[PDB]
Amino acid sequence: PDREKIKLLTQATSEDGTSASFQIVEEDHTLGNALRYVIMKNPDVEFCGYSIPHPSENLLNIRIQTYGETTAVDALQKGLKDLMDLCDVVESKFTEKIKSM
């Protein structure tokens, strides 16, 4: 039950969601860029981008603004699910080509 990993920044959050900034510690461009790509691949997402506010801190601030269909949290959760699925496809294809060789 990790309660420190991902936080919701309330000052950056709208009413009823659909626009929220998340703070993700121990994260950098690696997860930020893949997550942003996958999240932009969602029709309801109108805005996605991350930022590492300072190199000294291992912190990532990812901003999601959606249209009214879904909330930023839902778009985030969908982005994480889709990133997992994509990496699973990559794993299967790569292990198959390794086995074939």
Partner: peptide
């Protein structure tokens, strides 16, 4: 080569400490 070393071995380093 042509070996699925990762399936054969149960990884431990890769999990977060």
């Amino acid at each position: 080569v042509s070996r699925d070393t990762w399936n054969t071995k149960n990884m431990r380093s890769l999990e977060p400490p």
